[PDB]
Amino acid sequence: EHYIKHPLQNRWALWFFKNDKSKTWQANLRLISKFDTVEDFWALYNHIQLSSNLMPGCDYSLFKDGIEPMWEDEKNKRGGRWLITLNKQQRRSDLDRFWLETLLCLIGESFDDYSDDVCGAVVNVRAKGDKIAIWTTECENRDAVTHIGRVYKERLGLPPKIVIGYQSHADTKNRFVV
């Protein structure tokens, strides 16, 4: 039994974005690799730069295989995102640990039945303040959106003194808050 890699519920794809002004936004999105096992996840995570060490303007994106990390994808166009906004000091304190936790919420299917509503997650490294978001497939499903946001907020360890917002991509305003 000790020779079988541990298969994830889904295959995931990790994307990288670099703000090169000579290309279109979409041409700046690059697929890095895919994995579908625990071991291959850690092999890739241990290979790549921490989000706190990326140049401002880059993104990582982890999405279920077959969902591109853009609003235009069939599974994102009716959806939205749970947004965490980081201040500039939280790049040192919280960015990397929040991001790795977000990645585990995804590959570990941490939102019960509603993990089917998850499309992926995105971290934006920005001089103006970093951002992490979980993208879900349908803003009109209030049960799935709300329960993902409650669990997400607790897995991040945010206190109720903090509130986080859900924004639909079509607007991208707050449609849900937990």
Tab-separated table of N, CA and C in Angstrom:
chain	number	residue	atom	x	y	z
A	1	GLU	N	0.823	-1.204	0.000
A	1	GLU	CA	0.000	0.000	0.000
A	1	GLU	C	0.861	1.260	0.000
A	2	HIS	N	2.080	1.137	0.528
A	2	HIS	CA	2.986	2.271	0.681
A	2	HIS	C	3.582	2.754	-0.637
A	3	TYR	N	3.170	2.202	-1.777
A	3	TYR	CA	3.751	2.566	-3.062
A	3	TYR	C	2.781	3.300	-3.971
A	4	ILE	N	1.575	3.596	-3.501
A	4	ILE	CA	0.549	4.261	-4.297
A	4	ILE	C	0.509	5.735	-3.913
A	5	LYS	N	0.654	6.614	-4.903
A	5	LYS	CA	0.427	8.024	-4.643
A	5	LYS	C	-1.034	8.231	-4.271
A	6	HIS	N	-1.281	9.252	-3.458
A	6	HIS	CA	-2.605	9.484	-2.907
A	6	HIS	C	-3.402	10.353	-3.858
A	7	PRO	N	-4.456	9.830	-4.477
A	7	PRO	CA	-5.119	10.571	-5.554
A	7	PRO	C	-6.060	11.619	-5.002
A	8	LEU	N	-6.004	12.807	-5.597
A	8	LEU	CA	-6.913	13.857	-5.181
A	8	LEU	C	-8.287	13.631	-5.796
A	9	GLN	N	-9.301	14.269	-5.205
A	9	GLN	CA	-10.638	14.167	-5.772
A	9	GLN	C	-10.679	14.737	-7.187
A	10	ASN	N	-9.953	15.826	-7.434
A	10	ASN	CA	-9.868	16.423	-8.763
A	10	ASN	C	-8.431	16.574	-9.228
A	11	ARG	N	-8.286	16.684	-10.543
A	11	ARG	CA	-7.028	17.127	-11.101
A	11	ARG	C	-7.096	18.644	-11.145
A	12	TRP	N	-5.977	19.273	-10.850
A	12	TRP	CA	-5.900	20.711	-10.685
A	12	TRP	C	-4.844	21.237	-11.641
A	13	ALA	N	-4.988	22.492	-12.049
A	13	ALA	CA	-3.992	23.092	-12.916
A	13	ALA	C	-3.529	24.377	-12.250
A	14	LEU	N	-2.220	24.598	-12.247
A	14	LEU	CA	-1.638	25.780	-11.627
A	14	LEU	C	-1.211	26.723	-12.743
A	15	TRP	N	-1.664	27.964	-12.662
A	15	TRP	CA	-1.401	28.973	-13.671
A	15	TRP	C	-0.549	30.076	-13.059
A	16	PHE	N	0.175	30.795	-13.923
A	16	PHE	CA	0.995	31.936	-13.540
A	16	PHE	C	0.659	33.074	-14.489
A	17	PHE	N	0.609	34.288	-13.960
A	17	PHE	CA	0.368	35.471	-14.769
A	17	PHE	C	1.472	36.476	-14.488
A	18	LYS	N	2.011	37.080	-15.542
A	18	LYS	CA	2.962	38.176	-15.378
A	18	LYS	C	2.481	39.374	-16.184
A	19	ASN	N	2.441	40.538	-15.538
A	19	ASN	CA	1.997	41.771	-16.182
A	19	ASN	C	3.071	42.253	-17.155
A	20	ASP	N	3.084	41.665	-18.346
A	20	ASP	CA	3.911	42.169	-19.439
A	20	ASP	C	3.034	43.056	-20.322
A	21	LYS	N	3.380	44.347	-20.408
A	21	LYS	CA	2.506	45.297	-21.083
A	21	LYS	C	2.521	45.131	-22.598
A	22	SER	N	3.488	44.403	-23.145
A	22	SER	CA	3.510	44.229	-24.585
A	22	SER	C	2.541	43.151	-25.060
A	23	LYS	N	1.915	42.407	-24.151
A	23	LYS	CA	0.945	41.411	-24.582
A	23	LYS	C	-0.432	41.673	-23.997
A	24	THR	N	-1.421	40.991	-24.568
A	24	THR	CA	-2.766	41.020	-24.014
A	24	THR	C	-2.788	40.323	-22.649
A	25	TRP	N	-3.819	40.628	-21.857
A	25	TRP	CA	-3.959	39.957	-20.569
A	25	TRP	C	-3.976	38.448	-20.739
A	26	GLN	N	-4.696	37.951	-21.749
A	26	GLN	CA	-4.869	36.498	-21.848
A	26	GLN	C	-3.570	35.814	-22.261
A	27	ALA	N	-2.782	36.460	-23.126
A	27	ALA	CA	-1.501	35.916	-23.547
A	27	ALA	C	-0.489	35.893	-22.413
A	28	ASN	N	-0.749	36.639	-21.340
A	28	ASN	CA	0.131	36.686	-20.189
A	28	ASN	C	-0.165	35.572	-19.194
A	29	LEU	N	-1.302	34.895	-19.351
A	29	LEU	CA	-1.660	33.722	-18.557
A	29	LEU	C	-0.937	32.498	-19.104
A	30	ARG	N	-0.198	31.804	-18.245
A	30	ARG	CA	0.557	30.621	-18.643
A	30	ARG	C	0.213	29.447	-17.732
A	31	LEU	N	-0.068	28.295	-18.321
A	31	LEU	CA	-0.258	27.100	-17.511
A	31	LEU	C	1.104	26.556	-17.093
A	32	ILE	N	1.299	26.360	-15.789
A	32	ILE	CA	2.589	25.864	-15.306
A	32	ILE	C	2.635	24.345	-15.342
A	33	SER	N	1.718	23.706	-14.631
A	33	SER	CA	1.594	22.262	-14.740
A	33	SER	C	0.261	21.846	-14.138
A	34	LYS	N	-0.051	20.582	-14.319
A	34	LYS	CA	-1.185	19.959	-13.668
A	34	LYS	C	-0.664	18.852	-12.767
A	35	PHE	N	-1.472	18.522	-11.756
A	35	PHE	CA	-1.229	17.419	-10.832
A	35	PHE	C	-2.573	16.871	-10.384
A	36	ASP	N	-2.581	15.606	-9.930
A	36	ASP	CA	-3.817	15.036	-9.406
A	36	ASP	C	-3.564	14.111	-8.216
A	37	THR	N	-2.438	14.278	-7.533
A	37	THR	CA	-2.086	13.504	-6.349
A	37	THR	C	-1.504	14.440	-5.297
A	38	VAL	N	-1.601	13.994	-4.043
A	38	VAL	CA	-1.006	14.720	-2.925
A	38	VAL	C	0.479	14.944	-3.164
A	39	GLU	N	1.209	13.865	-3.484
A	39	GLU	CA	2.656	13.968	-3.636
A	39	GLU	C	3.033	14.945	-4.744
A	40	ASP	N	2.298	14.922	-5.862
A	40	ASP	CA	2.628	15.807	-6.969
A	40	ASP	C	2.289	17.248	-6.625
A	41	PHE	N	1.275	17.458	-5.779
A	41	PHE	CA	0.980	18.799	-5.288
A	41	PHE	C	2.163	19.374	-4.522
A	42	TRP	N	2.672	18.622	-3.538
A	42	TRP	CA	3.778	19.105	-2.716
A	42	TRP	C	5.055	19.221	-3.527
A	43	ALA	N	5.260	18.330	-4.495
A	43	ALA	CA	6.415	18.467	-5.369
A	43	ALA	C	6.360	19.787	-6.117
A	44	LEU	N	5.177	20.160	-6.585
A	44	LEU	CA	5.083	21.408	-7.320
A	44	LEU	C	5.145	22.600	-6.376
A	45	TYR	N	4.416	22.549	-5.254
A	45	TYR	CA	4.451	23.657	-4.301
A	45	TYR	C	5.866	23.923	-3.807
A	46	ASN	N	6.646	22.865	-3.577
A	46	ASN	CA	8.015	23.041	-3.103
A	46	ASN	C	8.967	23.521	-4.193
A	47	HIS	N	8.560	23.481	-5.460
A	47	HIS	CA	9.403	23.871	-6.583
A	47	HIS	C	9.321	25.360	-6.892
A	48	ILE	N	8.219	26.009	-6.525
A	48	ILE	CA	7.840	27.293	-7.091
A	48	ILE	C	8.004	28.399	-6.049
A	49	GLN	N	7.993	29.645	-6.524
A	49	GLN	CA	8.191	30.781	-5.623
A	49	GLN	C	7.004	30.951	-4.694
A	50	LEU	N	7.280	31.288	-3.431
A	50	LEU	CA	6.200	31.753	-2.565
A	50	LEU	C	5.559	32.996	-3.156
A	51	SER	N	4.261	33.163	-2.891
A	51	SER	CA	3.556	34.328	-3.422
A	51	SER	C	4.177	35.616	-2.921
A	52	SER	N	4.739	35.605	-1.705
A	52	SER	CA	5.380	36.814	-1.189
A	52	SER	C	6.681	37.183	-1.893
A	53	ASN	N	7.251	36.297	-2.703
A	53	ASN	CA	8.498	36.559	-3.408
A	53	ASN	C	8.287	36.847	-4.887
A	54	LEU	N	7.034	36.928	-5.345
A	54	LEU	CA	6.773	37.290	-6.732
A	54	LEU	C	6.860	38.799	-6.931
A	55	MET	N	7.232	39.210	-8.144
A	55	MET	CA	7.186	40.629	-8.477
A	55	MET	C	5.741	41.116	-8.424
A	56	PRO	N	5.501	42.343	-7.979
A	56	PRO	CA	4.132	42.868	-7.998
A	56	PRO	C	3.578	42.892	-9.415
A	57	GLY	N	2.316	42.506	-9.541
A	57	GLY	CA	1.701	42.311	-10.829
A	57	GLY	C	1.547	40.865	-11.251
A	58	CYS	N	2.136	39.915	-10.522
A	58	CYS	CA	1.962	38.523	-10.897
A	58	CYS	C	0.740	37.941	-10.203
A	59	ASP	N	0.254	36.817	-10.740
A	59	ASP	CA	-0.777	36.032	-10.087
A	59	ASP	C	-0.363	34.570	-10.109
A	60	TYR	N	-0.736	33.851	-9.069
A	60	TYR	CA	-0.941	32.419	-9.225
A	60	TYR	C	-2.429	32.140	-9.285
A	61	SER	N	-2.780	31.072	-9.998
A	61	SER	CA	-4.143	30.587	-10.057
A	61	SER	C	-4.095	29.071	-9.995
A	62	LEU	N	-4.952	28.483	-9.172
A	62	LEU	CA	-5.131	27.036	-9.177
A	62	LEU	C	-6.579	26.762	-9.524
A	63	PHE	N	-6.804	26.062	-10.631
A	63	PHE	CA	-8.157	25.758	-11.037
A	63	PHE	C	-8.293	24.273	-11.353
A	64	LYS	N	-9.510	23.783	-11.154
A	64	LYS	CA	-9.861	22.446	-11.610
A	64	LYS	C	-9.569	22.326	-13.099
A	65	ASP	N	-8.933	21.226	-13.471
A	65	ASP	CA	-8.595	20.975	-14.862
A	65	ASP	C	-9.819	21.123	-15.755
A	66	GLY	N	-9.672	21.929	-16.814
A	66	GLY	CA	-10.768	22.230	-17.716
A	66	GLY	C	-11.491	23.530	-17.429
A	67	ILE	N	-11.132	24.235	-16.353
A	67	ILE	CA	-11.670	25.550	-16.063
A	67	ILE	C	-10.508	26.535	-16.190
A	68	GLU	N	-10.548	27.376	-17.217
A	68	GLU	CA	-9.521	28.403	-17.296
A	68	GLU	C	-9.800	29.494	-16.268
A	69	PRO	N	-8.749	30.121	-15.721
A	69	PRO	CA	-8.922	31.073	-14.613
A	69	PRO	C	-9.299	32.471	-15.094
A	70	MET	N	-10.362	32.557	-15.883
A	70	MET	CA	-10.845	33.842	-16.356
A	70	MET	C	-12.359	33.849	-16.290
A	71	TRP	N	-12.907	35.050	-16.113
A	71	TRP	CA	-14.354	35.239	-16.090
A	71	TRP	C	-15.041	34.599	-17.283
A	72	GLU	N	-14.336	34.469	-18.407
A	72	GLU	CA	-14.979	34.077	-19.654
A	72	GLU	C	-15.338	32.602	-19.682
A	73	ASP	N	-14.689	31.779	-18.858
A	73	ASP	CA	-14.931	30.345	-18.881
A	73	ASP	C	-16.383	30.054	-18.542
A	74	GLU	N	-16.932	29.025	-19.203
A	74	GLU	CA	-18.317	28.625	-18.972
A	74	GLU	C	-18.618	28.491	-17.489
A	75	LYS	N	-17.688	27.944	-16.722
A	75	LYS	CA	-17.970	27.697	-15.309
A	75	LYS	C	-17.682	28.890	-14.414
A	76	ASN	N	-17.153	29.987	-14.957
A	76	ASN	CA	-16.970	31.194	-14.170
A	76	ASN	C	-17.972	32.298	-14.506
A	77	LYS	N	-18.610	32.261	-15.687
A	77	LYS	CA	-19.349	33.429	-16.163
A	77	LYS	C	-20.591	33.732	-15.325
A	78	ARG	N	-21.208	32.731	-14.700
A	78	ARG	CA	-22.337	32.995	-13.813
A	78	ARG	C	-21.931	33.068	-12.344
A	79	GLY	N	-20.633	33.021	-12.046
A	79	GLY	CA	-20.159	32.882	-10.693
A	79	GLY	C	-19.608	34.169	-10.110
A	80	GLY	N	-18.802	34.011	-9.078
A	80	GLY	CA	-18.178	35.126	-8.412
A	80	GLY	C	-17.040	34.629	-7.562
A	81	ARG	N	-16.611	35.464	-6.617
A	81	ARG	CA	-15.441	35.118	-5.829
A	81	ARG	C	-15.607	35.603	-4.396
A	82	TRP	N	-15.074	34.821	-3.472
A	82	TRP	CA	-14.886	35.258	-2.093
A	82	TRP	C	-13.531	35.943	-2.010
A	83	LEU	N	-13.519	37.217	-1.618
A	83	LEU	CA	-12.322	38.044	-1.698
A	83	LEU	C	-11.736	38.286	-0.310
A	84	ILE	N	-10.439	38.028	-0.170
A	84	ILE	CA	-9.638	38.435	0.976
A	84	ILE	C	-8.761	39.585	0.494
A	85	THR	N	-8.832	40.732	1.160
A	85	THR	CA	-7.976	41.869	0.822
A	85	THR	C	-6.896	42.006	1.886
A	86	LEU	N	-5.636	41.983	1.451
A	86	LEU	CA	-4.486	42.077	2.332
A	86	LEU	C	-3.935	43.496	2.289
A	87	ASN	N	-3.534	44.019	3.443
A	87	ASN	CA	-2.788	45.269	3.393
A	87	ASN	C	-1.316	44.971	3.132
A	88	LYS	N	-0.532	46.031	2.961
A	88	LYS	CA	0.840	45.823	2.525
A	88	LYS	C	1.656	45.098	3.591
A	89	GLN	N	1.313	45.268	4.870
A	89	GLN	CA	2.047	44.559	5.912
A	89	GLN	C	1.682	43.076	5.953
A	90	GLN	N	0.491	42.716	5.491
A	90	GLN	CA	0.111	41.303	5.499
A	90	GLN	C	0.770	40.475	4.394
A	91	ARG	N	1.498	41.082	3.452
A	91	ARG	CA	2.297	40.263	2.551
A	91	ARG	C	3.347	39.475	3.320
A	92	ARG	N	3.922	40.082	4.357
A	92	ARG	CA	4.903	39.390	5.181
A	92	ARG	C	4.242	38.405	6.129
A	93	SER	N	3.156	38.814	6.781
A	93	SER	CA	2.589	38.036	7.881
A	93	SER	C	1.608	36.962	7.424
A	94	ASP	N	0.781	37.243	6.407
A	94	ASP	CA	-0.391	36.414	6.121
A	94	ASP	C	-0.474	35.903	4.691
A	95	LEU	N	0.150	36.575	3.726
A	95	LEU	CA	-0.044	36.195	2.332
A	95	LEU	C	0.240	34.712	2.112
A	96	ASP	N	1.457	34.266	2.437
A	96	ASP	CA	1.832	32.897	2.078
A	96	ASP	C	1.018	31.865	2.856
A	97	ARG	N	0.771	32.100	4.140
A	97	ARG	CA	0.042	31.084	4.892
A	97	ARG	C	-1.436	31.051	4.495
A	98	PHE	N	-2.055	32.215	4.268
A	98	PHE	CA	-3.413	32.235	3.715
A	98	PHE	C	-3.474	31.537	2.364
A	99	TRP	N	-2.471	31.757	1.494
A	99	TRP	CA	-2.534	31.143	0.163
A	99	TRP	C	-2.425	29.626	0.243
A	100	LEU	N	-1.474	29.114	1.028
A	100	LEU	CA	-1.332	27.664	1.136
A	100	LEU	C	-2.584	27.033	1.735
A	101	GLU	N	-3.203	27.703	2.711
A	101	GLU	CA	-4.468	27.225	3.273
A	101	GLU	C	-5.576	27.187	2.222
A	102	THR	N	-5.658	28.232	1.399
A	102	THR	CA	-6.606	28.275	0.291
A	102	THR	C	-6.396	27.107	-0.651
A	103	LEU	N	-5.132	26.821	-0.981
A	103	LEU	CA	-4.809	25.694	-1.845
A	103	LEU	C	-5.276	24.377	-1.223
A	104	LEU	N	-5.125	24.235	0.093
A	104	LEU	CA	-5.552	23.006	0.765
A	104	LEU	C	-7.070	22.893	0.815
A	105	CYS	N	-7.766	24.005	1.070
A	105	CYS	CA	-9.223	24.000	0.980
A	105	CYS	C	-9.679	23.483	-0.376
A	106	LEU	N	-8.946	23.824	-1.435
A	106	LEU	CA	-9.328	23.370	-2.769
A	106	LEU	C	-9.031	21.883	-2.958
A	107	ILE	N	-7.762	21.479	-2.831
A	107	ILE	CA	-7.403	20.108	-3.187
A	107	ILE	C	-7.962	19.108	-2.186
A	108	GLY	N	-8.156	19.525	-0.925
A	108	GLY	CA	-8.799	18.705	0.095
A	108	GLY	C	-10.321	18.722	0.113
A	109	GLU	N	-10.961	19.404	-0.845
A	109	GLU	CA	-12.423	19.458	-0.985
A	109	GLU	C	-13.075	19.827	0.352
A	110	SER	N	-12.721	20.999	0.860
A	110	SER	CA	-12.971	21.304	2.266
A	110	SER	C	-14.365	21.848	2.530
A	111	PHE	N	-15.160	22.095	1.501
A	111	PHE	CA	-16.488	22.673	1.670
A	111	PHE	C	-17.608	21.650	1.463
A	112	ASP	N	-17.369	20.400	1.839
A	112	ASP	CA	-18.418	19.364	1.852
A	112	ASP	C	-19.000	19.233	0.441
A	113	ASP	N	-20.321	19.063	0.319
A	113	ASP	CA	-20.950	18.955	-0.994
A	113	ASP	C	-20.670	20.171	-1.849
A	114	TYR	N	-20.556	21.341	-1.221
A	114	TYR	CA	-20.409	22.578	-1.969
A	114	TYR	C	-19.041	22.726	-2.611
A	115	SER	N	-18.095	21.821	-2.334
A	115	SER	CA	-16.816	21.885	-3.035
A	115	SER	C	-16.992	21.712	-4.536
A	116	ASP	N	-18.100	21.098	-4.970
A	116	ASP	CA	-18.422	21.060	-6.393
A	116	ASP	C	-18.653	22.459	-6.965
A	117	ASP	N	-19.073	23.416	-6.143
A	117	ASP	CA	-19.267	24.764	-6.656
A	117	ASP	C	-17.954	25.522	-6.830
A	118	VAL	N	-16.872	25.076	-6.189
A	118	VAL	CA	-15.577	25.737	-6.327
A	118	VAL	C	-15.038	25.500	-7.732
A	119	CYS	N	-14.590	26.575	-8.370
A	119	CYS	CA	-13.869	26.527	-9.636
A	119	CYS	C	-12.364	26.608	-9.440
A	120	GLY	N	-11.904	27.559	-8.629
A	120	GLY	CA	-10.506	27.619	-8.282
A	120	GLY	C	-10.244	28.816	-7.394
A	121	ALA	N	-8.970	29.173	-7.280
A	121	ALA	CA	-8.583	30.309	-6.460
A	121	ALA	C	-7.429	31.025	-7.110
A	122	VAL	N	-7.294	32.300	-6.741
A	122	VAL	CA	-6.375	33.244	-7.357
A	122	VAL	C	-5.731	34.058	-6.251
A	123	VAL	N	-4.417	34.203	-6.308
A	123	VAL	CA	-3.746	35.226	-5.516
A	123	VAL	C	-3.167	36.263	-6.465
A	124	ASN	N	-3.434	37.544	-6.185
A	124	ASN	CA	-2.830	38.663	-6.902
A	124	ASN	C	-1.813	39.325	-5.994
A	125	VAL	N	-0.572	39.386	-6.446
A	125	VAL	CA	0.473	40.126	-5.758
A	125	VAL	C	0.478	41.494	-6.409
A	126	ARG	N	0.270	42.544	-5.604
A	126	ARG	CA	0.095	43.911	-6.092
A	126	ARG	C	0.748	44.901	-5.138
A	127	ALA	N	1.477	45.871	-5.695
A	127	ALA	CA	1.988	46.951	-4.859
A	127	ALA	C	0.862	47.579	-4.050
A	128	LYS	N	-0.333	47.666	-4.639
A	128	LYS	CA	-1.446	48.351	-3.995
A	128	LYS	C	-2.079	47.545	-2.873
A	129	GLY	N	-1.677	46.287	-2.686
A	129	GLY	CA	-2.271	45.435	-1.680
A	129	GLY	C	-2.628	44.093	-2.294
A	130	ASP	N	-2.189	42.983	-1.700
A	130	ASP	CA	-2.413	41.674	-2.307
A	130	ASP	C	-3.841	41.228	-2.091
A	131	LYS	N	-4.235	40.208	-2.856
A	131	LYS	CA	-5.586	39.678	-2.807
A	131	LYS	C	-5.523	38.178	-3.032
A	132	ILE	N	-6.380	37.464	-2.324
A	132	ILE	CA	-6.624	36.046	-2.539
A	132	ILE	C	-8.121	35.889	-2.744
A	133	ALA	N	-8.522	35.024	-3.664
A	133	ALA	CA	-9.943	34.822	-3.860
A	133	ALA	C	-10.209	33.368	-4.213
A	134	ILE	N	-11.301	32.820	-3.686
A	134	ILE	CA	-11.859	31.554	-4.172
A	134	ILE	C	-12.976	31.863	-5.164
A	135	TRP	N	-12.880	31.292	-6.357
A	135	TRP	CA	-13.914	31.428	-7.368
A	135	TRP	C	-14.875	30.243	-7.328
A	136	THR	N	-16.169	30.547	-7.321
A	136	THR	CA	-17.231	29.567	-7.322
A	136	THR	C	-18.060	29.775	-8.578
A	137	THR	N	-18.901	28.793	-8.905
A	137	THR	CA	-19.435	28.731	-10.262
A	137	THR	C	-20.755	29.471	-10.446
A	138	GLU	N	-21.482	29.790	-9.377
A	138	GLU	CA	-22.832	30.329	-9.559
A	138	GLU	C	-23.179	31.235	-8.389
A	139	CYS	N	-23.223	32.545	-8.642
A	139	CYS	CA	-23.546	33.489	-7.578
A	139	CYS	C	-24.982	33.331	-7.080
A	140	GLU	N	-25.889	32.804	-7.907
A	140	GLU	CA	-27.283	32.699	-7.486
A	140	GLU	C	-27.542	31.572	-6.489
A	141	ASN	N	-26.570	30.694	-6.230
A	141	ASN	CA	-26.752	29.620	-5.247
A	141	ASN	C	-26.265	30.134	-3.896
A	142	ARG	N	-27.183	30.729	-3.132
A	142	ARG	CA	-26.781	31.398	-1.900
A	142	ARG	C	-26.290	30.414	-0.851
A	143	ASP	N	-26.839	29.195	-0.830
A	143	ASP	CA	-26.395	28.192	0.137
A	143	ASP	C	-24.938	27.812	-0.097
A	144	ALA	N	-24.586	27.522	-1.347
A	144	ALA	CA	-23.216	27.142	-1.666
A	144	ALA	C	-22.257	28.297	-1.422
A	145	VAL	N	-22.625	29.499	-1.867
A	145	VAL	CA	-21.746	30.652	-1.690
A	145	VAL	C	-21.536	30.928	-0.208
A	146	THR	N	-22.626	30.992	0.547
A	146	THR	CA	-22.523	31.351	1.957
A	146	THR	C	-21.706	30.328	2.734
A	147	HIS	N	-22.011	29.041	2.560
A	147	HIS	CA	-21.309	28.019	3.330
A	147	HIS	C	-19.835	27.933	2.949
A	148	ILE	N	-19.498	28.173	1.680
A	148	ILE	CA	-18.086	28.248	1.304
A	148	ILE	C	-17.416	29.416	2.008
A	149	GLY	N	-18.128	30.531	2.159
A	149	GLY	CA	-17.495	31.708	2.729
A	149	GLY	C	-17.291	31.576	4.224
A	150	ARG	N	-18.256	30.960	4.910
A	150	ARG	CA	-18.131	30.721	6.342
A	150	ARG	C	-16.973	29.785	6.642
A	151	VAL	N	-16.907	28.654	5.935
A	151	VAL	CA	-15.826	27.706	6.173
A	151	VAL	C	-14.496	28.337	5.810
A	152	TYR	N	-14.453	29.010	4.663
A	152	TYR	CA	-13.217	29.644	4.226
A	152	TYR	C	-12.704	30.603	5.292
A	153	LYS	N	-13.599	31.439	5.820
A	153	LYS	CA	-13.223	32.431	6.822
A	153	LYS	C	-12.668	31.777	8.085
A	154	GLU	N	-13.241	30.638	8.493
A	154	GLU	CA	-12.760	29.977	9.703
A	154	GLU	C	-11.454	29.230	9.450
A	155	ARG	N	-11.322	28.603	8.284
A	155	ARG	CA	-10.074	27.929	7.937
A	155	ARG	C	-8.915	28.919	7.832
A	156	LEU	N	-9.191	30.142	7.369
A	156	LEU	CA	-8.193	31.202	7.419
A	156	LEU	C	-7.953	31.705	8.833
A	157	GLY	N	-8.864	31.426	9.759
A	157	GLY	CA	-8.703	31.904	11.114
A	157	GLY	C	-9.024	33.366	11.304
A	158	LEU	N	-9.843	33.950	10.431
A	158	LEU	CA	-10.234	35.339	10.616
A	158	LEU	C	-11.267	35.446	11.737
A	159	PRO	N	-11.210	36.496	12.543
A	159	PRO	CA	-12.204	36.679	13.601
A	159	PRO	C	-13.477	37.289	13.049
A	160	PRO	N	-14.605	37.133	13.748
A	160	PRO	CA	-15.842	37.796	13.300
A	160	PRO	C	-15.725	39.308	13.219
A	161	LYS	N	-14.772	39.913	13.929
A	161	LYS	CA	-14.500	41.332	13.737
A	161	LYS	C	-14.142	41.644	12.290
A	162	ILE	N	-13.653	40.662	11.553
A	162	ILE	CA	-13.425	40.791	10.122
A	162	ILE	C	-14.675	40.318	9.401
A	163	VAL	N	-14.996	40.960	8.285
A	163	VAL	CA	-16.013	40.455	7.377
A	163	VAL	C	-15.415	40.415	5.976
A	164	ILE	N	-15.781	39.394	5.212
A	164	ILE	CA	-15.271	39.207	3.863
A	164	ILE	C	-16.455	39.228	2.908
A	165	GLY	N	-16.174	39.580	1.657
A	165	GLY	CA	-17.213	39.851	0.685
A	165	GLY	C	-17.184	38.866	-0.469
A	166	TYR	N	-18.362	38.617	-1.040
A	166	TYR	CA	-18.499	37.831	-2.260
A	166	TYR	C	-18.960	38.758	-3.373
A	167	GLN	N	-18.194	38.805	-4.455
A	167	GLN	CA	-18.520	39.643	-5.595
A	167	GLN	C	-18.742	38.745	-6.800
A	168	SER	N	-19.813	39.005	-7.541
A	168	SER	CA	-20.032	38.300	-8.793
A	168	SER	C	-19.116	38.861	-9.875
A	169	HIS	N	-18.603	37.967	-10.719
A	169	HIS	CA	-17.711	38.391	-11.791
A	169	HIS	C	-18.390	39.359	-12.745
A	170	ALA	N	-19.699	39.210	-12.952
A	170	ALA	CA	-20.406	40.122	-13.846
A	170	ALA	C	-20.291	41.557	-13.352
A	171	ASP	N	-20.451	41.764	-12.043
A	171	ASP	CA	-20.199	43.083	-11.478
A	171	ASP	C	-18.725	43.454	-11.604
A	172	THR	N	-17.830	42.512	-11.313
A	172	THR	CA	-16.395	42.707	-11.532
A	172	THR	C	-16.060	42.626	-13.023
A	173	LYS	N	-18.850	45.723	-5.946
A	173	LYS	CA	-20.036	45.550	-5.114
A	173	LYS	C	-20.018	44.191	-4.418
A	174	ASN	N	-20.697	44.110	-3.278
A	174	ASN	CA	-20.762	42.903	-2.462
A	174	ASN	C	-22.160	42.306	-2.564
A	175	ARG	N	-22.244	41.032	-2.952
A	175	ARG	CA	-23.525	40.333	-2.968
A	175	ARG	C	-23.762	39.489	-1.724
A	176	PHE	N	-22.708	38.935	-1.128
A	176	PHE	CA	-22.809	38.236	0.145
A	176	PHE	C	-21.649	38.656	1.033
A	177	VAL	N	-21.879	38.615	2.342
A	177	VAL	CA	-20.851	38.927	3.326
A	177	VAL	C	-20.969	37.938	4.474
A	178	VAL	N	-19.833	37.407	4.916
A	178	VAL	CA	-19.786	36.569	6.112
A	178	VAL	C	-18.674	37.062	7.039
